[PDB]
């Protein structure tokens, strides 16, 4: 929310990052379940989709204004399904999809993103 | 009760060459069946039960396919004992539902035949269960449990499984009457899972409390060859206790032979493989002449069939004989090659096909045909 | 390293037994002519060359 | 094509038709080889049962199984040669294929 | 699975019964000779199996097609043998040779 | 959710529609639009279209579409074979069959959605653009059955002309095409 | 796991914790030939292989069978030596030559 508020007050290029967002569902989870709903899927709670909406959607840029709401997540989900649930929805909500590619980490080329799927 | 319970080591035979000999089972006997039924395979099983060696027919099947439950039923009373000259369906037991029945109605299926084997058995007969559409009858315990709380385990069938499927199986063999003689109670598995698979828990779980298993095939039966058990994926643990028995009475060299016969699997299929699929051309007598004794113990050994009264029934010391020929053909056959003489001349002396002949030649005649037949190889040999 | 995906997988990688199992049917008896045509070659080869090279 | 052979029988390829090369010296016959194949009109370089056969590897590492000209072995004195047919057979089955 | 009983002698003729099991080991034998045909061509292959590309080639287009054409079971029957002229005979050898013989 | 076409929602959904596309992923991933899979998608809906075609633009068109979509599907009919084995058990009606195929997805099914004329379509030149594939299909064959070198058919700069038909523009599209199939029968009639 | 434990002198004899390892790295090499003949070429592999390969055949149906009957840690040594024997002692890396002179 220091977000809309230096973007559109005070009027800003700011970069706007989030990382570990992967950790955020976990806890998410805990309330979701611990309380009560049934898992609205592959052991998570279904309004993870709009908890994970919410987030994303914020971005963008209004008619005039010299703000700039970027928004740049990154996280990881383990092995590289990108089926694996978090980034599955994520996908759907958001917009950009640019990968690492583990294949040529260990081959020694830096930044390793490619495109393998990684399609803007 | 029933006391004691003994022990196994007595045979149990139904006349069909192949299956008893390679593959004896006894009178705690448990095996099991597979292969497509509802198109044909199925006349062993009846035809199983018409010879036997007990003298009380039981037989029970449930949960099987409408249309072919009627077949049983019809063609049951066009049979007439081969050891009594009265109607076979006297002596007979039918338990039967067909699918669309009440559940527990399957639930009970078992139980029912089982407790009556006792009743029967007591009397101090004999019996011949079986079973068929084994792999179904776990069905029913399905629904059941579905109706309740349990949840299953593997693939969908119930955390009992082994269990009630076990006790079934416990009420067999050499039982001691509470009138002091015996009631054999062995029971044959026909399974069938959806498509001859063998990850389907009811397979892979029977198989093991069970001691031999009878696989019966397609292929076979493709190759105009009823019964059409393929002997190499089928054992039967038995043999171990049989073999005092077996020696006993029948032949001491009677073991012997049935060891001797197997070594045709061993070598025939590690003998064959790209060798069979580039035929005679390049090959060598010695090489050939395995799959020429094949042969002769494939279309005579291996074949036999239910249409006649000269064959397909049997005894011991019947087979014997015919095996220890064939046997008997290849011991001067390797010392035939080795004096360099034609192999496929051999082959079409009329003495070897006088073997052929044996199976079809009667019980009683079949002592001195065995006899006579025999020495005429003797001299065939060394005519050459 | 990468274990598969999870699901739907399943029917395709059965379509790639389909695709072996069917395929290596077949891988043979393509074979099975070649090896075929292959003995009459061998019969023939020395006939004329053992004769006349002697010659 | 040329080849080496016997001194004896080596006379006949000088003759006509052919070049001859043979001596009895050279048992490696790389003298020619690359010389030979310039041309490549010599297809073939034969050799006899009088050297040995197999160990053509020299051969082996400049082909790198290219079709240059190959050797059959010949008997260099007639008394029979026909065993090699005989044995020819499992010259291919022996070594891939089943075996005699 | 069951369809034995329903024909045959008495019922409709006593040859269409094996003229199915025929025309089964038949037809698909040929069909992939269609694809191995893709490795070599016709020539490696015998014109006694070459036929069998043949086949089913009117098997398919012209007996299995049927359009809205209705028919019947000799309409039928006889197009089968008919179909089987294409290749020499004693490759229908599950078939005793009196009924060859009323058809071919 | 999945992705995974398995998943129920999805799913009872054919059975109650009658024409139907599936989208691969690395088929756009790749430049591929508007991916859909040839082998994967139907209709039923074309079964009641043939009266208006028939008069409307053409009258042979179903004849010359099935007869396209008979290559489509049939094409896999060696890419399985292609796969176990490699592309190089090849002969004439092998690349042959290959190679048509390749060009019809190529220029046949694949468009912008940015490109300003390449983004809207209208029958009748599509109506053309089959039959000018049909055509060097036909001659093909005679080239072949001559005992051409497909190589050459590859080079022959009437492939890369019928490889620029979408890109082209209604008016001129008639005559394009038209001068296109003189320009085949000459890259062929004069081999 | 445990084994490099209750082994050694004046437990049981001394040669036996190396007797081990040698064997396992032999036979080890053995199948391994075994695989790549089906490969390349059977006879396409080292010739220093040859020998290997018998080796295999040896611990396999020579040793490893013994049917029923008793069988005696001393009895078992003695013919775990005659393992070795075949191939060199030039080529026994996981054992001292003391042994190698205790027995041959």
Not at chain 1, 78 to 97: K, M, N, V
Not at chain 2, 243 to 252: F, H, I, K, S
Request: proline content about 5%; overall charge negative; charged content about 25%.
């Amino acid at each position: 929310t220091v977000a809309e508020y230096l973007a559109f007050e005070h009027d800003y290029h700011v970069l706007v990052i989030l990382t570990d967002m992967t950790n955020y569902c976990e806890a998410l989870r805990e309330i979701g379940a611990a309380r009560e709903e049934i898992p609205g899927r592959r052991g998570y709670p279904g309004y993870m989709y709009t908890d994970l909406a919410t987030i994303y959607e914020r971005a963008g840029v209004v008619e005039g204004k010299k703000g700039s709401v970027t928004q740049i997540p990154i996280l990881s989900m383990p092995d590289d399904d990108r089926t694996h649930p978090i980034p599955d929805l994520t996908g759907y909500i958001t917009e950009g999809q640019i990968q690492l590619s583990r294949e040529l980490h260990r081959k020694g080329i830096y930044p390793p993103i490619d495109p393998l799927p990684s399609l803007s | 009760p029933v006391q004691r319970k003994l022990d196994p080591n007595t045979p149990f035979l139904t006349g069909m060459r192949i299956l008893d000999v390679l593959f004896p089972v006894a009178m705690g006997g448990t095996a099991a069946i597979p292969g497509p039924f509802g198109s044909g395979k199925t006349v062993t099983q009846q035809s199983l039960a018409k010879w036997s060696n007990a003298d009380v027919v039981v037989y029970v099947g449930c949960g099987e396919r409408g249309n072919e439950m009627t077949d049983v039923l019809v063609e049951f009373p066009e049979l007439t004992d081969p050891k009594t000259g009265g109607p076979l369906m006297h002596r007979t037991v039918l338990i039967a539902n067909t699918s669309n029945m009440p559940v527990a109605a399957r639930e009970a299926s078992i139980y029912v035949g089982v407790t009556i084997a006792e009743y029967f058995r007591d009397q101090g007969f004999s019996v011949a269960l079986m079973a068929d559409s084994t792999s179904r009858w776990a069905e029913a315990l399905r629904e059941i449990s579905s109706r309740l709380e349990e949840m299953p385990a593997e693939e969908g069938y119930p955390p009992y499984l082994a269990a009630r499927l076990a006790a079934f199986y416990e009420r067999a063999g050499k039982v001691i009457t509470l009138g002091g003689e015996e009631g054999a109670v062995t029971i044959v598995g026909a399974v069938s899972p959806p498509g001859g698979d063998m990850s389907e828990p009811v397979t892979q779980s029977t198989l093991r409390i069970v001691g031999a298993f009878w696989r019966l095939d397609a292929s076979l039966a493709f190759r105009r060859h009823f019964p059409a058990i393929n002997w190499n994926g089928s054992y039967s643990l038995f043999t171990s206790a049989l073999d005092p028995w077996y020696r006993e009475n029948v032949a001491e060299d009677y073991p012997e032979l049935r060891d001797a016969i197997s070594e045709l699997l061993q070598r025939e299929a590690g003998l064959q493989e790209i060798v069979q699929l580039v035929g005679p051309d390049a090959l060598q007598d010695a090489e050939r002449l395995v799959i020429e004794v094949g042969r002769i113990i494939r279309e005579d050994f291996l074949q036999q069939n239910a249409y006649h009264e000269v064959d397909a029934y049997c005894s011991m010391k019947k087979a014997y004989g015919i095996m220890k020929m064939i046997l008997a053909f290849y011991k001067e056959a390797e010392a035939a090659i080795k004096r360099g003489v034609s192999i496929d001349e051999i082959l079409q002396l009329p003495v070897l096909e006088r073997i052929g002949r044996a199976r079809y030649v009667s019980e009683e005649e079949f002592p001195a045909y065995f006899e006579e037949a025999m020495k005429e190889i003797q001299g065939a040999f060394k005519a050459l | 390293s990468q274990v598969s995906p999870t699901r739907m997988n399943l029917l395709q990688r059965r379509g790639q037994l389909r695709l072996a199992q069917k395929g290596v049917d077949l891988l043979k008896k393509k074979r099975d002519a070649l090896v075929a045509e292959f003995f009459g070659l061998v019969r023939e080869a020395m006939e004329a060359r053992k004769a006349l090279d002697q010659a | 094509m040329a080849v080496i052979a016997d001194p004896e029988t080596a006379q006949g390829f000088r003759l006509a038709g052919l070049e001859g090369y043979g001596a009895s010296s050279a048992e490696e016959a790389q003298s020619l080889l690359e010389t030979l194949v310039e041309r490549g009109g010599y297809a073939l370089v034969a050799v006899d049962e009088a050297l040995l056969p197999d160990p053509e590897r020299a051969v082996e590492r400049l082909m790198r199984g290219r079709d240059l000209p190959v050797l059959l072995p010949i008997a260099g004195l007639k008394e029979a040669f026909q065993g090699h047919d005989v044995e020819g057979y499992m010259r291919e089955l022996v070594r891939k294929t089943i075996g005699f | 699975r069951l369809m034995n009983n329903g024909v045959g002698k008495g019922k409709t003729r006593e040859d269409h019964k094996q003229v199915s099991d025929q025309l089964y080991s038949a037809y698909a034998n040929g069909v992939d000779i269609r694809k191995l045909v893709a490795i070599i061509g016709e020539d490696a292959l015998t014109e006694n199996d070459r036929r069998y590309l043949q086949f089913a080639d009117a098997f398919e287009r012209f007996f299995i097609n049927q359009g809205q054409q209705n028919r019947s079971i000799e309409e039928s029957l006889q197009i089968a043998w008919a179909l089987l002229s294409m290749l020499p005979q004693g490759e229908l050898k599950r078939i005793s040779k009196d009924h060859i013989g009323k058809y071919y």
